[PDB]
Design a protein around this nucleic acid. Structure first.
Ligand SMILES: [K+]
Ligand SMILES: [Mg+2]
Ligand SMILES: [Mg+2]
Ligand SMILES: [Mg+2]
Ligand SMILES: [Mg+2]
Ligand SMILES: [Zn+2]
Lengths: 177, 71, 162, 133, 99, 42, 38, 69
RNA sequence: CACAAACGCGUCUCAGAGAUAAUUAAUGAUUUAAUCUUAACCUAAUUAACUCAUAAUAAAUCCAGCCCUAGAACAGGGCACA
C-alpha cells in the first residue's frame, strides 16, 4: 500500500464499531455473530495473544423473540453465597426486570472462558430501545444483517399479494362463519 | 466521501482569554489517587481495571532489555 | 356465507338469515385429480406456520377453525393445519382474527413477549428448575412433530427438541 | 427572595431536621398511663444545597441539611471554602434528605423545631452506641 | 518433557490458526470455509492452508480471485445436479490429466 | 474528482499528510510494488 | 380429586377434558368420580 | 501474480512461462533440540539431542515469459 | 449498681405493591350443541416464597498535641464562644 510503517500498522489493527438490530431476533442467533466480532474471528490477522477486537452495539433488546416455549421453560439461576440464597428466575421474569440481561448472559456464556472474556465484554454495548447517545452513534461503521427473516403478519400483506395467492377451496354458500 | 471536518476544534484549540493580557498555558491538573485514576483510564480505553496496576520487581527485571526486531 | 340478524322492535323479536356472496375456488388447479384441497394445489409438505395466506382460508372470523367436513381436508392434513393455526396465533400473526371486546382493551397489561414456533400454550408449561446433565437432559420442545414431513432443501432433519 | 411555594399535594414529602439528643423524661397521658419521651433539641439547622431530580435519583430531589455549628480551625480546606460561598459557619454532621419537587426550599433557609407539629409520627436515624469488639 | 509434547502440538496449533484465518477471510466474501476448500480442490489447485493464510493477509486481491474461483466452481456443480446429469462438464470443471 | 492517493492515520491532520506521502511516492516512481533492482550480470 | 395414573369412567356421565397439560375426569352427578392424571 | 494479474496452475505452471532462480548462502546446523520421554514411577528416562542440518536460500529474481495461449 | 457507666427482670419500635401452585368461574372453536383453553383474544376469584417501592450509606486531599458516651493496633468525632 506504500504506507509508512507507523500508519500501516495502525490501519491494520484498527477497531471497528458494528450495529446489530434486535427487533424480533432470537438471542442465540444474535449472540452467535456478536461473539465472533468481539473475539476478532472475522479478521484474517486474528491471534489470541493480540488485542484484536471490535465493538458491537446491539439495540432493541427488549423485543427479542425466544423460539418455542423458552419464555416459560428456560430458567436463569444464581446463588448469592449466603445459606438459603439460591434464586431461580424464569426467562420471562428476568426479561421483565432487566431488559438486557437475556442477551448479555447469552453472549457472556459463548465467549472463550479465559481472562480476556472480562476485557472483551466491556466493548459490548446493549440498549433496550433505539435511544443511543450521540457519542456512540458517531463511532459506528456498518450494520450487520439480521440473522432471522421476520415474517410479516396478515395485515402487512398488500392487496395485490392477497389477490395473487390462489383460493384453495370453495366454501358452501349456506354455512355460517 | 464526505468533506474534511477541518474546523472542528476551531475555537477550542485557539482561545484568547483576553485582549489586554497575554494568553496563559495553564494546564490545570487534579492528580487523582490510584483509585479514581485507573477507573478513568479503563473507561477511556474500554478495558478492565486489573491491567493498569504495576507489577513487582521480579516480573520487571526478567523482561528482555533488547527484544529481537524483524524487518 | 350466511349471517343471522336479530332485531328488537317494540316487544317483537325478528330473526332472519341473509345470504352474502361467497368467493369461489380459483379456476385452474395444477393437479385437477386431487382429492383434498391441500394436495389438489401441490401444497402437500410445502407450507409452514409462516404461510398466513394459506392458514387464513380455513379459520373463522373470530379465530376458530372450520370443521373438516366443510373444508374437505384429509385427516392427516387437517391436524397439521390445526397445529399451524395454533402456532400462528401464538406467534403474533393474524391480528384481525381476535374477538372484539371494547371494555378489555383499555386495561393494558405487561407488554407481549414475542415468540414463534410455540408447541404448547403459554399458561400450561412449568419452568425446568432441574434441567439435568447431558446423559438425561430435559429438552425444550420447539415446533411440532406433525411438521417433520416438510421438504428440507438443506437436507438436514429439523431439530424439533432443543 | 425565596423560591416559590406550592400548595400541598398527595404523595408529597417534606424536609427533615438535624437535632441533638439531650436525654429522657417521663410523661403521663390523660388515661393515667406513663410514657417516656426523649428530648431532641434543634441547635443550628440550615439547608445547605439543592440537587436536581435528574442528578440525584431520578425520582425525587435531594436537599442537604447541616448539623450544629463547629469551629473553623478543624475543618478541611474544601469544607471551609464551601461554607464561605454560602455564608454560614461550618456544620458537624451533614445528611441527605429525599424531597419531592413541590417542597423544595432555597438553600440557606433556617429550620426550627416548629417544623413538626405535635400529633405526628416521625422517624429517627443516628449511629447507635458502639460497644467495640 | 513438556518441550517435546508441545513440539508435537506446535504443528497442530498452527494448522488450527491457519484455518481460522482462512475462514475469517472467506466469510468476508460471503463463502464458508467448507465450500471454499472443496470447490478449490475441484479446480486442481493444490495450495496448502499455510500459503492460503498468507495470501489472505498480504494478498487481499488475489485471495478474492481464489474466492471468486471457488464460488464459480461451486455454482457449476449445483447446475449439473439440477439438470439431467448429462450436461457437459463446466468450463471450469473440466479435469486435465497430465500423462 | 479522481483518486490518486489515500492514507490512514490517528487524526485527520496526520492522515492527510500520509495521503500526500503516498501521492509523492507514486509520482516519483518509488512505490513498494516497483520493479526490484536488477542484480544480474550486465 | 384423586391423583391416579390411568383414567377410567366410573359412570356414563364422566367426560374427559384436557386442562393445564393433564387429562381430568370431571363428573357432574357424582363428584367422587373426579380424577386427575399424574 | 502481481498487482493487476495472477496466474493459477493445474496444479503446476509450465517451465516456459515462469522462471525462478535462487542462490544458496549458508549450509549450517540447527540449534540443539531436546527430545525427552518420561514415564511415572517406572524409572524410564530417555534424553537425546537432535542437530538437523539446514540450508539457507536467497531468491534473486522471478521472471514471467510473455508466452501464454 | 461503693465510677460519671454497663446491664435485665425494665422501657421503646416492627410496614405497602407486584407476582404466583392446586383449584374455581366467564366467553368460545376443532365437534355451528356442550366444554375454565399444552385452541386463540379479553377477563375474574386465588398459598407461601420471591422481586420491588421505600428507608439506611453520601463533603476526595486541617490533623503535631490534648479530650471523647470512638477504639485491640490503625481508624473516627470534638479542641470559636465552653
Ligand atoms: K373440548
Ligand atoms: Mg466504646
Ligand atoms: Mg358453542
Ligand atoms: Mg431495593
Ligand atoms: Mg477527625
Ligand atoms: Zn361419573
Amino acid at each position: 500500500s506504500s504506507f509508512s510503517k507507523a500508519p500501516q500498522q495502525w490501519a491494520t489493527f484498527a477497531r471497528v464499531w458494528y450495529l446489530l438490530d434486535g427487533k424480533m431476533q432470537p438471542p442465540g442467533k444474535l449472540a452467535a455473530m456478536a461473539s465472533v466480532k468481539l473475539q476478532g474471528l472475522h479478521k484474517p490477522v486474528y491471534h489470541q495473544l493480540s488485542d484484536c477486537g471490535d465493538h458491537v452495539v446491539i439495540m432493541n433488546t427488549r423485543h427479542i423473540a425466544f423460539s418455542g416455549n423458552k419464555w416459560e421453560q428456560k430458567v436463569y439461576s444464581s446463588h448469592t453465597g449466603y445459606p438459603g440464597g439460591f434464586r431461580q428466575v424464569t426467562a420471562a421474569q428476568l426479561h421483565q426486570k432487566d431488559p438486557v440481561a437475556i442477551v448479555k448472559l447469552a453472549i457472556y456464556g459463548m465467549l472463550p472462558k479465559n481472562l480476556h472474556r472480562r476485557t472483551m465484554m466491556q466493548r459490548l454495548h446493549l440498549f433496550p430501545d433505539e435511544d443511543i447517545p450521540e457519542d456512540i452513534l458517531k463511532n459506528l461503521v456498518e450494520e450487520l444483517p439480521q440473522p432471522r427473516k421476520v415474517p410479516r403478519r396478515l395485515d402487512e400483506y398488500t392487496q395485490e399479494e392477497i389477490e395473487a395467492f390462489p383460493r384453495v377451496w370453495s366454501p358452501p354458500e349456506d354455512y355460517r362463519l | 466521501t464526505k468533506p474534511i471536518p477541518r474546523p472542528d476544534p476551531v475555537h477550542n484549540i485557539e482561545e484568547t482569554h483576553d485582549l489586554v493580557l497575554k494568553t496563559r498555558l495553564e494546564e490545570k491538573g487534579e492528580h487523582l489517587e490510584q483509585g479514581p485514576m485507573i477507573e478513568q483510564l479503563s473507561k477511556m480505553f474500554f478495558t478492565t481495571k486489573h491491567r493498569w496496576y504495576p507489577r513487582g520487581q521480579y516480573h520487571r527485571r526478567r523482561r528482555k532489555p533488547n527484544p529481537p526486531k524483524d524487518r | 356465507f350466511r349471517e343471522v340478524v336479530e332485531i328488537l322492535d317494540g316487544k317483537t323479536t325478528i330473526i332472519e338469515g341473509r345470504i352474502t356472496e361467497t368467493p369461489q375456488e380459483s379456476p385452474n388447479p395444477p393437479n385437477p385429480t386431487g382429492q383434498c384441497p391441500i394436495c389438489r394445489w401441490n401444497l402437500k409438505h410445502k407450507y409452514n406456520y409462516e404461510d398466513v395466506l394459506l392458514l387464513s382460508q380455513f379459520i373463522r372470523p373470530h379465530g376458530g377453525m372450520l370443521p373438516r367436513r366443510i373444508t374437505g381436508l384429509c385427516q392427516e392434513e387437517h391436524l397439521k393445519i390445526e397445529e399451524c393455526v395454533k402456532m400462528a396465533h401464538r406467534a403474533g400473526l393474524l391480528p384481525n382474527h381476535r374477538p372484539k371486546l371494547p371494555e378489555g382493551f383499555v386495561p393494558k397489561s405487561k407488554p407481549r413477549l414475542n415468540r414463534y414456533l410455540t408447541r404448547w400454550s403459554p399458561r400450561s408449561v412449568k419452568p425446568i428448575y432441574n434441567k439435568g446433565h447431558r446423559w438425561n437432559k430435559v429438552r425444550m420442545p420447539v415446533g411440532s412433530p406433525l411438521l417433520k414431513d416438510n421438504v428440507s432443501y438443506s437436507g438436514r432433519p429439523l431439530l424439533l427438541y432443543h | 427572595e425565596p423560591w416559590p411555594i406550592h400548595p400541598w399535594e398527595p404523595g408529597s414529602s417534606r424536609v427533615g431536621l438535624i437535632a441533638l439528643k439531650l436525654g429522657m423524661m417521663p410523661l403521663w397521658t390523660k388515661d393515667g398511663q406513663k410514657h417516656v419521651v426523649t428530648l431532641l433539641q434543634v441547635q443550628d439547622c440550615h439547608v445547605l444545597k439543592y440537587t436536581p431530580k435528574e442528578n440525584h435519583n431520578g425520582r425525587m430531589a435531594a436537599l442537604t441539611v447541616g448539623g450544629k455549628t463547629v469551629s473553623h480551625f478543624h475543618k478541611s480546606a474544601s469544607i471551609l471554602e464551601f461554607y464561605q460561598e454560602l455564608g454560614l459557619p461550618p456544620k458537624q454532621k451533614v445528611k441527605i434528605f429525599n424531597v419531592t419537587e413541590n417542597a423544595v426550599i432555597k438553600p440557606g433557609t433556617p429550620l426550627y423545631a416548629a417544623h413538626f407539629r405535635p400529633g405526628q409520627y416521625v422517624d429517627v436515624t443516628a449511629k447507635t452506641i458502639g460497644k467495640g469488639f | 518433557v513438556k518441550c517435546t509434547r508441545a513440539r508435537r502440538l506446535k504443528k497442530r496449533s498452527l494448522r488450527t490458526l491457519w484455518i481460522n484465518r482462512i475462514t475469517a477471510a472467506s466469510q468476508e466474501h460471503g463463502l464458508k470455509y467448507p465450500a471454499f476448500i472443496i470447490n478449490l480442490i475441484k479446480c486442481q489447485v493444490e495450495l496448502n492452508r499455510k500459503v492460503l493464510a498468507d495470501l489472505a493477509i498480504y494478498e487481499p486481491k488475489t485471495f478474492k480471485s481464489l474466492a471468486a474461483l471457488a464460488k464459480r466452481r461451486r455454482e457449476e456443480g449445483f447446475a449439473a445436479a439440477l439438470g439431467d446429469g448429462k450436461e457437459p462438464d463446466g468450463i471450469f470443471s473440466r479435469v486435465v490429466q497430465h500423462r | 474528482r479522481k483518486l490518486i492517493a489515500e492514507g490512514p492515520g490517528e487524526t485527520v491532520l496526520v492522515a492527510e499528510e500520509e495521503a500526500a506521502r503516498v501521492a509523492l511516492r507514486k509520482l516519483f516512481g518509488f512505490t513498494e510494488n516497483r520493479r526490484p533492482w536488477d542484480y544480474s550480470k550486465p | 380429586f384423586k391423583t391416579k395414573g390411568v383414567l377410567k369412567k366410573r359412570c356414563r356421565d364422566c367426560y374427559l377434558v384436557k386442562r393445564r397439560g393433564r387429562w381430568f375426569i370431571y363428573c357432574k352427578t357424582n363428584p367422587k368420580h373426579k380424577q386427575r392424571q399424574m | 501474480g502481481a498487482d493487476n494479474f495472477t496466474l493459477l496452475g493445474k496444479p503446476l505452471l509450465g517451465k516456459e512461462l515462469v522462471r525462478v532462480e535462487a542462490t544458496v548462502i549458508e549450509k549450517t546446523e540447527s540449534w540443539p533440540k531436546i527430545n525427552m520421554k518420561f514415564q511415572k514411577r517406572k524409572n524410564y528416562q530417555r534424553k537425546r539431542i537432535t542437530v538437523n542440518p539446514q540450508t539457507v536460500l536467497r531468491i534473486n529474481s522471478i521472471e514471467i515469459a510473455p508466452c501464454l495461449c
